[PDB]
Amino acid sequence: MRITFNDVKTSLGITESYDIVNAIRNSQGDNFKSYVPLATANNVAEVGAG
C-alpha cells in the first residue's frame, strides 16, 4: 500500500539559462568571485530552490 517515485528528478520543470555552479568554478576576476570563499555553495545551489 506504499507508493514510491522511481528516478525522480529535482529539476523537473526547471529551465537553467546558465550553470551558476560552473560559472562560480571558472571565475578569475569575474563578478562571481564574491562566492569563492563559500564552502557549502556546492550543496546550497542544488536544493535552495525547493
Binding site: 570563499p37 563559500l38 564552502a39 557549502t40
Partner: protein, 50 residues
C-alpha cells in the same frame, strides 16, 4: 590589524585525526616614524632700529 578567516566544511570522518590542528589568525601591521625637524630663524637690531 586583524583580518577575517575562511570557512571550513564539516567532516566528522577526518575530524578524528586533526583535533589539535593549528591555523594562524592572519594579522597585519604598519609602522610610522618621526620625519620633520625644522626651525625658523630671525634677527632684531634694536639699537640700530631706533
Amino acid at each position: 590589524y586583524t583580518d577575517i578567516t575562511k570557512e571550513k566544511q564539516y567532516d566528522a570522518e577526518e575530524a578524528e585525526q586533526k583535533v589539535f590542528e593549528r591555523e594562524m589568525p592572519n594579522v597585519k601591521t604598519l609602522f610610522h616614524e618621526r620625519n620633520r625637524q625644522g626651525f625658523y630663524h630671525q634677527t632684531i637690531q634694536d639699537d640700530s632700529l631706533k
